[PDB]
Ligand binder design. Structure first.
Ligand code: SRM
Ligand code: SF4
Ligand SMILES: [K+]
Length: 456
Protein backbone atom coordinates (compact mmCIF):
# COMPACT_ATOMS: atom_id res chain seq x y z
CA UNK A 1 0.00 0.00 0.00
CA UNK A 2 1.20 3.42 -1.05
CA UNK A 3 -0.60 6.65 -1.75
CA UNK A 4 0.79 9.73 -3.51
CA UNK A 5 0.73 13.33 -2.29
CA UNK A 6 -1.25 15.04 -5.07
CA UNK A 7 -2.60 18.43 -3.85
CA UNK A 8 -5.88 19.39 -5.45
CA UNK A 9 -6.19 16.08 -7.34
CA UNK A 10 -4.33 17.57 -10.29
CA UNK A 11 -2.05 15.03 -12.03
CA UNK A 12 -0.33 15.25 -15.40
CA UNK A 13 -0.89 13.09 -18.46
CA UNK A 14 2.80 12.30 -18.18
CA UNK A 15 2.48 11.24 -14.52
CA UNK A 16 -0.64 9.31 -15.40
CA UNK A 17 1.31 7.23 -17.96
CA UNK A 18 3.97 6.33 -15.43
CA UNK A 19 1.58 5.09 -12.70
CA UNK A 20 -0.55 3.20 -15.23
CA UNK A 21 2.58 1.28 -16.19
CA UNK A 22 3.43 0.59 -12.57
CA UNK A 23 -0.19 -0.36 -11.66
CA UNK A 24 -0.45 -3.14 -14.20
CA UNK A 25 3.20 -4.19 -14.15
CA UNK A 26 4.08 -4.38 -10.49
CA UNK A 27 1.04 -4.86 -8.27
CA UNK A 28 -1.11 -7.90 -7.49
CA UNK A 29 -4.41 -6.19 -8.42
CA UNK A 30 -3.07 -4.18 -11.38
CA UNK A 31 -5.58 -1.45 -10.66
CA UNK A 32 -5.50 2.23 -10.04
CA UNK A 33 -7.74 3.17 -7.07
CA UNK A 34 -8.90 6.79 -7.05
CA UNK A 35 -9.59 7.82 -3.50
CA UNK A 36 -12.13 10.18 -2.03
CA UNK A 37 -9.24 12.48 -0.93
CA UNK A 38 -8.28 13.31 -4.55
CA UNK A 39 -5.41 10.86 -5.00
CA UNK A 40 -4.75 7.27 -6.08
CA UNK A 41 -3.85 3.97 -4.47
CA UNK A 42 -1.92 0.93 -5.74
CA UNK A 43 -3.00 -2.41 -4.18
CA UNK A 44 -0.63 -5.29 -3.62
CA UNK A 45 2.79 -3.91 -4.51
CA UNK A 46 5.05 -6.98 -4.73
CA UNK A 47 11.32 1.52 -6.65
CA UNK A 48 7.77 2.90 -6.30
CA UNK A 49 9.47 6.07 -5.07
CA UNK A 50 12.10 6.19 -7.80
CA UNK A 51 9.26 6.01 -10.38
CA UNK A 52 7.17 8.52 -8.36
CA UNK A 53 10.20 10.79 -8.06
CA UNK A 54 11.02 10.55 -11.79
CA UNK A 55 7.60 11.95 -12.70
CA UNK A 56 7.71 14.51 -9.85
CA UNK A 57 5.53 12.77 -7.25
CA UNK A 58 6.15 11.92 -3.60
CA UNK A 59 4.30 9.68 -1.18
CA UNK A 60 4.15 11.78 2.02
CA UNK A 61 6.05 10.47 11.05
CA UNK A 62 3.93 12.90 9.01
CA UNK A 63 0.31 13.15 10.14
CA UNK A 64 -0.54 15.45 7.24
CA UNK A 65 -2.98 13.94 4.75
CA UNK A 66 -3.72 15.05 1.16
CA UNK A 67 -5.04 18.67 0.85
CA UNK A 68 -8.26 18.87 -1.27
CA UNK A 69 -9.57 21.56 -3.62
CA UNK A 70 -12.83 22.03 -5.46
CA UNK A 71 -12.12 20.26 -8.70
CA UNK A 72 -14.64 21.78 -11.15
CA UNK A 73 -15.92 25.18 -9.91
CA UNK A 74 -18.97 26.77 -11.53
CA UNK A 75 -16.75 29.90 -11.89
CA UNK A 76 -13.99 28.00 -13.72
CA UNK A 77 -11.38 30.78 -13.28
CA UNK A 78 -11.20 30.60 -9.50
CA UNK A 79 -9.74 27.07 -9.67
CA UNK A 80 -6.15 27.91 -10.53
CA UNK A 81 -5.87 30.37 -7.64
CA UNK A 82 -7.71 28.07 -5.20
CA UNK A 83 -5.41 25.33 -6.49
CA UNK A 84 -2.19 27.40 -6.10
CA UNK A 85 -3.22 27.96 -2.49
CA UNK A 86 -4.01 24.28 -1.88
CA UNK A 87 -0.51 23.43 -3.08
CA UNK A 88 1.09 26.10 -0.83
CA UNK A 89 -0.72 25.00 2.32
CA UNK A 90 0.40 21.45 1.46
CA UNK A 91 4.05 22.50 1.14
CA UNK A 92 4.00 24.81 4.16
CA UNK A 93 2.62 22.03 6.38
CA UNK A 94 5.31 19.55 5.29
CA UNK A 95 7.65 18.65 8.23
CA UNK A 96 6.06 19.34 14.73
CA UNK A 97 4.36 15.99 15.56
CA UNK A 98 0.59 15.92 15.52
CA UNK A 99 -1.23 13.76 18.10
CA UNK A 100 -3.48 12.48 15.34
CA UNK A 101 -3.64 13.03 11.58
CA UNK A 102 -4.70 16.42 10.09
CA UNK A 103 -6.90 16.92 7.06
CA UNK A 104 -7.24 20.25 5.22
CA UNK A 105 -9.18 21.51 2.19
CA UNK A 106 -9.74 24.56 -0.04
CA UNK A 107 -13.49 24.87 -0.80
CA UNK A 108 -15.01 26.98 -3.59
CA UNK A 109 -18.70 27.74 -2.80
CA UNK A 110 -21.31 26.65 -3.56
CA UNK A 111 -19.71 23.26 -4.08
CA UNK A 112 -18.82 21.11 -1.08
CA UNK A 113 -17.48 18.26 -3.24
CA UNK A 114 -14.55 17.95 -0.88
CA UNK A 115 -16.85 17.27 2.10
CA UNK A 116 -15.37 19.94 4.39
CA UNK A 117 -17.14 18.68 7.51
CA UNK A 118 -15.02 15.56 7.54
CA UNK A 119 -11.90 17.78 7.91
CA UNK A 120 -9.72 19.40 10.58
CA UNK A 121 -8.85 22.55 8.64
CA UNK A 122 -10.94 24.19 5.92
CA UNK A 123 -10.24 27.35 3.87
CA UNK A 124 -13.46 28.44 2.23
CA UNK A 125 -12.64 30.84 -0.61
CA UNK A 126 -14.22 34.31 -0.85
CA UNK A 127 -13.95 36.05 -4.21
CA UNK A 128 -14.67 39.46 -5.61
CA UNK A 129 -14.53 40.28 -9.31
CA UNK A 130 -13.23 36.82 -10.16
CA UNK A 131 -10.49 37.38 -7.62
CA UNK A 132 -10.03 35.50 -4.37
CA UNK A 133 -9.80 37.99 -1.51
CA UNK A 134 -9.48 35.72 1.49
CA UNK A 135 -10.78 32.66 3.26
CA UNK A 136 -13.44 31.76 5.77
CA UNK A 137 -11.80 29.37 8.23
CA UNK A 138 -13.61 26.25 9.44
CA UNK A 139 -11.98 24.01 12.03
CA UNK A 140 -12.91 20.77 13.73
CA UNK A 141 -14.55 18.27 11.39
CA UNK A 142 -13.99 14.57 11.81
CA UNK A 143 -15.93 11.37 11.09
CA UNK A 144 -14.28 8.44 12.84
CA UNK A 145 -16.11 6.70 15.67
CA UNK A 146 -15.93 3.51 17.68
CA UNK A 147 -18.92 1.10 17.87
CA UNK A 148 -20.68 1.53 21.23
CA UNK A 149 -18.10 3.98 22.61
CA UNK A 150 -20.15 7.08 23.47
CA UNK A 151 -16.99 9.06 24.13
CA UNK A 152 -16.14 8.97 20.42
CA UNK A 153 -18.18 10.95 17.89
CA UNK A 154 -18.27 12.50 14.42
CA UNK A 155 -18.28 16.28 14.38
CA UNK A 156 -18.83 19.03 11.84
CA UNK A 157 -16.30 21.85 11.50
CA UNK A 158 -16.85 25.17 13.31
CA UNK A 159 -16.46 28.65 11.86
CA UNK A 160 -13.65 30.73 13.26
CA UNK A 161 -14.02 33.77 11.00
CA UNK A 162 -12.71 35.54 7.91
CA UNK A 163 -9.11 36.29 7.06
CA UNK A 164 -7.39 38.12 4.12
CA UNK A 165 -5.37 36.13 1.63
CA UNK A 166 -2.13 37.50 3.08
CA UNK A 167 -2.72 35.69 6.39
CA UNK A 168 -3.31 32.23 5.09
CA UNK A 169 -0.11 30.31 5.91
CA UNK A 170 0.29 31.96 9.33
CA UNK A 171 -3.19 30.74 10.22
CA UNK A 172 -2.76 27.25 8.82
CA UNK A 173 0.36 26.97 10.92
CA UNK A 174 -1.18 28.32 14.18
CA UNK A 175 -4.15 25.98 13.85
CA UNK A 176 -1.77 23.03 13.38
CA UNK A 177 0.37 24.12 16.29
CA UNK A 178 -2.42 24.82 18.76
CA UNK A 179 -3.58 21.28 17.93
CA UNK A 180 -0.02 19.90 18.30
CA UNK A 181 0.23 21.36 21.75
CA UNK A 182 -3.39 21.02 22.97
CA UNK A 183 -4.10 17.57 21.54
CA UNK A 184 -4.68 14.87 24.19
CA UNK A 185 -1.51 13.34 25.69
CA UNK A 186 -2.80 10.03 27.01
CA UNK A 187 -5.23 8.38 24.58
CA UNK A 188 -5.17 8.60 20.78
CA UNK A 189 -8.95 8.24 20.42
CA UNK A 190 -9.43 11.66 21.98
CA UNK A 191 -6.53 13.29 20.14
CA UNK A 192 -8.50 14.63 17.18
CA UNK A 193 -9.09 18.40 16.81
CA UNK A 194 -12.85 17.82 17.08
CA UNK A 195 -12.08 16.59 20.62
CA UNK A 196 -9.65 19.33 21.59
CA UNK A 197 -12.16 22.03 20.46
CA UNK A 198 -14.87 20.45 22.59
CA UNK A 199 -12.52 20.23 25.56
CA UNK A 200 -11.16 23.82 25.54
CA UNK A 201 -13.98 25.45 23.61
CA UNK A 202 -14.13 26.93 20.12
CA UNK A 203 -13.59 30.50 21.35
CA UNK A 204 -10.69 29.46 23.50
CA UNK A 205 -8.99 27.67 20.67
CA UNK A 206 -9.81 30.58 18.36
CA UNK A 207 -8.12 33.18 20.56
CA UNK A 208 -4.92 31.10 20.86
CA UNK A 209 -4.98 30.90 17.10
CA UNK A 210 -5.40 34.69 16.74
CA UNK A 211 -2.77 35.24 19.36
CA UNK A 212 -0.36 32.90 17.54
CA UNK A 213 -1.06 34.31 14.07
CA UNK A 214 -0.84 37.94 15.11
CA UNK A 215 -4.28 38.71 13.68
CA UNK A 216 -7.92 39.13 14.71
CA UNK A 217 -10.44 37.37 12.54
CA UNK A 218 -13.07 39.26 10.66
CA UNK A 219 -16.77 38.31 10.80
CA UNK A 220 -17.58 35.30 8.62
CA UNK A 221 -18.29 36.24 4.97
CA UNK A 222 -21.50 34.92 3.28
CA UNK A 223 -21.23 31.49 1.67
CA UNK A 224 -23.57 28.62 0.89
CA UNK A 225 -23.33 25.23 -0.77
CA UNK A 226 -25.77 23.79 -3.28
CA UNK A 227 -24.29 20.30 -3.61
CA UNK A 228 -21.45 17.78 -3.26
CA UNK A 229 -21.69 15.99 -6.58
CA UNK A 230 -19.42 15.98 -9.63
CA UNK A 231 -20.53 17.46 -12.95
CA UNK A 232 -20.65 14.26 -14.92
CA UNK A 233 -20.31 14.85 -18.61
CA UNK A 234 -18.88 17.94 -20.37
CA UNK A 235 -18.85 21.54 -19.00
CA UNK A 236 -17.62 24.85 -20.40
CA UNK A 237 -14.33 25.84 -18.80
CA UNK A 238 -12.33 29.02 -19.62
CA UNK A 239 -11.70 30.32 -23.16
CA UNK A 240 -12.38 27.46 -25.59
CA UNK A 241 -11.54 24.91 -22.85
CA UNK A 242 -14.04 22.14 -22.01
CA UNK A 243 -14.16 19.67 -19.10
CA UNK A 244 -15.19 16.02 -19.28
CA UNK A 245 -15.87 14.41 -15.94
CA UNK A 246 -15.97 10.63 -16.18
CA UNK A 247 -17.90 8.59 -13.59
CA UNK A 248 -15.82 5.71 -12.29
CA UNK A 249 -17.57 3.26 -9.94
CA UNK A 250 -15.57 3.05 -6.75
CA UNK A 251 -12.81 4.78 -8.66
CA UNK A 252 -11.43 1.35 -9.44
CA UNK A 253 -9.58 1.69 -12.77
CA UNK A 254 -8.98 -1.61 -14.51
CA UNK A 255 -9.78 -3.22 -17.85
CA UNK A 256 -12.85 -5.32 -17.71
CA UNK A 257 -14.53 -7.74 -20.09
CA UNK A 258 -15.75 -5.37 -22.82
CA UNK A 259 -14.79 -2.35 -20.68
CA UNK A 260 -11.13 -1.35 -21.10
CA UNK A 261 -11.40 1.43 -18.49
CA UNK A 262 -7.64 1.40 -17.83
CA UNK A 263 -6.59 1.32 -21.48
CA UNK A 264 -9.21 3.95 -22.29
CA UNK A 265 -7.43 6.20 -19.80
CA UNK A 266 -3.94 5.59 -21.19
CA UNK A 267 -5.20 6.21 -24.71
CA UNK A 268 -6.85 9.44 -23.52
CA UNK A 269 -3.76 10.44 -21.56
CA UNK A 270 -1.66 10.10 -24.70
CA UNK A 271 -3.65 12.65 -26.70
CA UNK A 272 -4.92 14.93 -23.92
CA UNK A 273 -3.41 18.42 -24.02
CA UNK A 274 -3.98 19.40 -20.38
CA UNK A 275 -4.10 17.37 -17.20
CA UNK A 276 -6.59 15.31 -15.17
CA UNK A 277 -8.16 15.97 -11.82
CA UNK A 278 -9.11 13.27 -9.30
CA UNK A 279 -12.36 14.34 -7.63
CA UNK A 280 -13.43 14.02 -4.02
CA UNK A 281 -16.06 11.59 -5.39
CA UNK A 282 -13.55 9.06 -6.72
CA UNK A 283 -14.10 10.16 -10.36
CA UNK A 284 -11.80 11.78 -12.91
CA UNK A 285 -11.96 14.99 -14.90
CA UNK A 286 -10.17 15.40 -18.22
CA UNK A 287 -9.24 19.11 -17.88
CA UNK A 288 -8.36 21.71 -20.46
CA UNK A 289 -9.96 20.16 -23.50
CA UNK A 290 -9.90 22.61 -26.41
CA UNK A 291 -13.23 22.65 -28.24
CA UNK A 292 -11.37 21.22 -31.24
CA UNK A 293 -10.39 17.99 -29.43
CA UNK A 294 -13.74 17.06 -27.89
CA UNK A 295 -14.66 14.57 -30.67
CA UNK A 296 -11.34 12.76 -30.25
CA UNK A 297 -11.52 12.55 -26.42
CA UNK A 298 -15.19 11.56 -26.27
CA UNK A 299 -14.85 8.81 -28.86
CA UNK A 300 -12.14 7.04 -26.80
CA UNK A 301 -14.12 7.29 -23.50
CA UNK A 302 -17.19 6.05 -25.37
CA UNK A 303 -15.15 3.14 -26.76
CA UNK A 304 -13.68 2.13 -23.42
CA UNK A 305 -16.95 2.20 -21.46
CA UNK A 306 -15.94 5.28 -19.46
CA UNK A 307 -19.10 7.27 -20.35
CA UNK A 308 -21.63 4.56 -19.65
CA UNK A 309 -24.85 6.16 -18.45
CA UNK A 310 -25.81 5.41 -14.85
CA UNK A 311 -28.67 6.83 -12.80
CA UNK A 312 -28.31 10.07 -10.82
CA UNK A 313 -28.45 7.81 -7.73
CA UNK A 314 -25.35 5.80 -8.58
CA UNK A 315 -23.63 9.11 -9.45
CA UNK A 316 -24.19 10.28 -5.94
CA UNK A 317 -23.24 7.09 -4.04
CA UNK A 318 -19.88 6.19 -2.48
CA UNK A 319 -18.15 3.42 -0.49
CA UNK A 320 -14.68 2.99 1.04
CA UNK A 321 -12.14 0.39 -0.15
CA UNK A 322 -12.75 -2.15 2.63
CA UNK A 323 -12.27 -5.85 1.71
CA UNK A 324 -10.16 -7.34 0.34
CA UNK A 325 -7.22 -4.99 1.03
CA UNK A 326 -8.18 -3.16 4.24
CA UNK A 327 -7.12 -4.96 7.40
CA UNK A 328 -9.64 -3.01 9.44
CA UNK A 329 -12.69 -3.86 7.40
CA UNK A 330 -15.75 -5.39 9.07
CA UNK A 331 -18.15 -5.57 6.11
CA UNK A 332 -17.76 -5.08 2.34
CA UNK A 333 -17.99 -1.56 0.92
CA UNK A 334 -16.56 -1.09 -2.58
CA UNK A 335 -17.44 -4.67 -3.51
CA UNK A 336 -20.95 -4.33 -2.03
CA UNK A 337 -22.01 -1.00 -3.46
CA UNK A 338 -22.75 -1.74 -7.17
CA UNK A 339 -25.22 -4.53 -6.41
CA UNK A 340 -26.70 -2.50 -3.63
CA UNK A 341 -27.17 0.52 -5.89
CA UNK A 342 -28.85 -1.82 -8.40
CA UNK A 343 -31.24 -2.79 -5.68
CA UNK A 344 -31.67 0.96 -4.82
CA UNK A 345 -32.23 2.03 -8.43
CA UNK A 346 -35.06 -0.55 -8.66
CA UNK A 347 -36.67 0.89 -5.51
CA UNK A 348 -36.29 4.50 -6.81
CA UNK A 349 -37.99 3.44 -10.09
CA UNK A 350 -40.69 1.69 -8.04
CA UNK A 351 -41.51 5.04 -6.49
CA UNK A 352 -41.22 7.34 -9.49
CA UNK A 353 -38.01 8.89 -8.19
CA UNK A 354 -35.59 7.47 -10.77
CA UNK A 355 -34.50 10.98 -11.83
CA UNK A 356 -33.74 11.83 -8.18
CA UNK A 357 -30.86 11.01 -5.88
CA UNK A 358 -30.15 10.37 -2.22
CA UNK A 359 -26.61 10.91 -0.91
CA UNK A 360 -25.87 7.26 -0.03
CA UNK A 361 -22.59 6.00 1.34
CA UNK A 362 -21.21 2.75 2.61
CA UNK A 363 -18.37 2.69 5.07
CA UNK A 364 -16.67 -0.65 5.75
CA UNK A 365 -15.93 -0.14 9.42
CA UNK A 366 -16.48 2.73 11.88
CA UNK A 367 -13.23 4.50 10.93
CA UNK A 368 -15.45 6.27 8.39
CA UNK A 369 -13.34 6.50 5.19
CA UNK A 370 -16.56 6.26 3.14
CA UNK A 371 -17.86 9.49 4.72
CA UNK A 372 -21.15 7.84 5.49
CA UNK A 373 -21.28 10.05 8.61
CA UNK A 374 -22.02 13.08 6.37
CA UNK A 375 -24.50 11.05 4.23
CA UNK A 376 -28.27 11.48 3.99
CA UNK A 377 -28.27 7.70 4.25
CA UNK A 378 -25.23 5.99 5.69
CA UNK A 379 -24.25 2.37 6.03
CA UNK A 380 -21.76 1.62 8.75
CA UNK A 381 -20.09 -1.80 8.73
CA UNK A 382 -20.42 -3.85 11.87
CA UNK A 383 -19.99 -7.49 10.79
CA UNK A 384 -19.95 -9.75 7.66
CA UNK A 385 -23.11 -8.68 5.79
CA UNK A 386 -24.18 -6.51 8.77
CA UNK A 387 -24.43 -2.68 8.96
CA UNK A 388 -25.78 0.16 11.12
CA UNK A 389 -28.22 2.24 9.10
CA UNK A 390 -28.09 5.97 9.64
CA UNK A 391 -30.55 8.54 8.26
CA UNK A 392 -31.10 12.30 8.47
CA UNK A 393 -28.15 14.00 6.84
CA UNK A 394 -28.61 16.50 3.98
CA UNK A 395 -27.46 16.95 0.39
CA UNK A 396 -24.78 19.52 1.18
CA UNK A 397 -23.21 17.64 4.09
CA UNK A 398 -23.61 19.80 7.19
CA UNK A 399 -25.59 17.28 9.26
CA UNK A 400 -24.45 14.04 10.88
CA UNK A 401 -27.03 11.20 10.46
CA UNK A 402 -28.28 9.54 13.67
CA UNK A 403 -28.32 5.75 13.74
CA UNK A 404 -31.76 4.55 12.77
CA UNK A 405 -31.17 0.74 12.94
CA UNK A 406 -28.23 -1.30 14.10
CA UNK A 407 -26.54 -4.58 13.01
CA UNK A 408 -29.01 -5.39 10.20
CA UNK A 409 -28.51 -7.12 6.83
CA UNK A 410 -28.95 -5.96 3.20
CA UNK A 411 -32.47 -7.46 2.90
CA UNK A 412 -33.49 -5.74 6.16
CA UNK A 413 -31.80 -2.53 4.99
CA UNK A 414 -33.58 -2.66 1.63
CA UNK A 415 -36.98 -3.11 3.29
CA UNK A 416 -36.46 -0.14 5.58
CA UNK A 417 -35.55 2.11 2.62
CA UNK A 418 -38.37 0.78 0.39
CA UNK A 419 -40.78 1.95 3.06
CA UNK A 420 -39.37 5.43 3.64
CA UNK A 421 -38.42 6.18 0.01
CA UNK A 422 -42.09 5.53 -0.66
CA UNK A 423 -43.11 7.95 2.11
CA UNK A 424 -40.78 10.66 0.78
CA UNK A 425 -41.93 10.16 -2.85
CA UNK A 426 -45.60 10.85 -1.99
CA UNK A 427 -45.15 13.26 0.93
CA UNK A 428 -42.09 15.41 0.30
CA UNK A 429 -42.38 19.06 -0.62
CA UNK A 430 -41.08 20.87 -3.69
CA UNK A 431 -37.50 19.70 -4.26
CA UNK A 432 -37.21 18.32 -0.74
CA UNK A 433 -34.20 16.07 -0.27
CA UNK A 434 -34.49 12.72 1.50
CA UNK A 435 -32.54 13.42 4.67
CA UNK A 436 -34.49 16.61 5.19
CA UNK A 437 -37.84 14.81 4.87
CA UNK A 438 -36.83 12.14 7.40
CA UNK A 439 -36.05 14.95 9.81
CA UNK A 440 -39.26 16.87 8.99
CA UNK A 441 -41.56 13.80 8.98
CA UNK A 442 -40.41 12.52 12.39
CA UNK A 443 -38.70 9.42 11.02
CA UNK A 444 -35.53 10.37 12.93
CA UNK A 445 -34.50 13.08 15.37
CA UNK A 446 -31.74 15.32 14.05
CA UNK A 447 -28.23 15.43 15.53
CA UNK A 448 -28.08 19.11 16.63
CA UNK A 449 -24.95 19.03 18.82
CA UNK A 450 -22.69 16.00 17.96
CA UNK A 451 -20.55 15.72 21.09
CA UNK A 452 -23.77 15.65 23.14
CA UNK A 453 -26.72 14.31 21.08
CA UNK A 454 -25.32 12.03 18.37
CA UNK A 455 -25.82 8.92 20.50
CA UNK A 456 -29.07 7.69 21.96
C1 SRM B 1 -8.64 4.93 0.32
C2 SRM B 1 -9.53 5.55 1.37
C3 SRM B 1 -11.03 5.40 1.31
C4 SRM B 1 -11.58 5.31 -0.09
O1 SRM B 1 -12.21 4.28 -0.37
O2 SRM B 1 -11.37 6.23 -0.90
C5 SRM B 1 -9.15 5.08 2.74
C6 SRM B 1 -8.67 3.83 3.11
C7 SRM B 1 -8.07 3.58 4.35
N1 SRM B 1 -7.90 4.48 5.40
FE1 SRM B 1 -8.97 6.33 5.64
N2 SRM B 1 -9.40 6.16 3.57
C8 SRM B 1 -9.72 7.35 2.96
C9 SRM B 1 -10.37 8.46 3.45
C10 SRM B 1 -10.69 8.70 4.75
C11 SRM B 1 -11.66 9.56 5.31
C12 SRM B 1 -12.54 10.48 4.51
C13 SRM B 1 -11.79 11.72 4.01
O3 SRM B 1 -10.70 12.04 4.53
O4 SRM B 1 -12.29 12.38 3.09
C14 SRM B 1 -11.80 9.37 6.66
C15 SRM B 1 -12.75 10.27 7.44
C16 SRM B 1 -12.53 11.59 8.22
C17 SRM B 1 -11.67 11.39 9.46
O5 SRM B 1 -10.48 11.02 9.29
O6 SRM B 1 -12.18 11.57 10.59
C18 SRM B 1 -10.87 8.32 6.98
C19 SRM B 1 -10.59 7.64 8.18
C20 SRM B 1 -9.59 6.70 8.57
C21 SRM B 1 -9.09 6.39 9.88
C22 SRM B 1 -9.78 6.81 11.23
C23 SRM B 1 -9.10 8.12 11.56
C24 SRM B 1 -9.24 8.54 13.00
O7 SRM B 1 -9.14 9.74 13.28
O8 SRM B 1 -9.42 7.68 13.87
C25 SRM B 1 -8.29 5.24 9.76
C26 SRM B 1 -7.79 4.31 10.89
C27 SRM B 1 -6.68 4.99 11.66
O9 SRM B 1 -6.01 5.87 11.07
O10 SRM B 1 -6.47 4.65 12.84
C28 SRM B 1 -8.19 4.94 8.38
C29 SRM B 1 -7.35 4.03 7.78
C30 SRM B 1 -7.37 3.77 6.44
C31 SRM B 1 -6.75 2.48 5.99
C32 SRM B 1 -5.32 2.94 5.55
C33 SRM B 1 -6.64 1.25 6.88
C34 SRM B 1 -5.35 1.01 7.65
O11 SRM B 1 -4.96 1.90 8.44
O12 SRM B 1 -4.73 -0.07 7.49
C35 SRM B 1 -7.47 2.20 4.69
C36 SRM B 1 -6.90 1.21 3.71
C37 SRM B 1 -7.64 0.41 2.66
C38 SRM B 1 -6.73 -0.07 1.55
O13 SRM B 1 -6.17 -1.18 1.69
O14 SRM B 1 -6.54 0.67 0.56
N3 SRM B 1 -8.89 5.90 7.70
N4 SRM B 1 -10.20 8.00 5.80
C39 SRM B 1 -9.18 7.06 1.58
C40 SRM B 1 -7.66 7.31 1.67
C41 SRM B 1 -7.73 8.81 1.43
C42 SRM B 1 -6.41 9.41 1.00
O15 SRM B 1 -6.15 9.50 -0.22
O16 SRM B 1 -5.64 9.81 1.88
S1 SF4 C 1 -13.71 2.59 6.65
FE1 SF4 C 1 -12.72 0.89 7.62
S2 SF4 C 1 -13.10 -0.74 5.99
FE2 SF4 C 1 -13.25 1.19 4.90
S3 SF4 C 1 -11.18 1.61 4.17
FE3 SF4 C 1 -11.43 2.80 6.16
S4 SF4 C 1 -10.49 1.42 7.64
FE4 SF4 C 1 -10.96 0.06 5.88
K1 LIG D 1 -16.59 7.77 -8.14
Amino acid sequence: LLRCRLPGGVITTKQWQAIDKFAGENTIYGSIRLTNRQTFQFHGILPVHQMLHSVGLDALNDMNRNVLCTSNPYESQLHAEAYEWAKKISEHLLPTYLPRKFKTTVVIPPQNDIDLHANDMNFVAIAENGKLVGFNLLVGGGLSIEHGNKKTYARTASEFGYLPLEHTLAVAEAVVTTQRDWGNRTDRKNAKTKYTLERVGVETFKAEVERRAGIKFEPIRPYEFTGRGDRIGWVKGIDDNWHLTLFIENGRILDYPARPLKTGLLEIAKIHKGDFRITANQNLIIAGVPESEKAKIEKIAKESGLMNAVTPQRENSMACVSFPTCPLAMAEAERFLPSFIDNIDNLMAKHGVSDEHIVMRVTGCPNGCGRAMLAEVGLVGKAPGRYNLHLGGNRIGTRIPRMYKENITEPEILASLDELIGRWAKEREAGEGFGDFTVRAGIIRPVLDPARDLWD
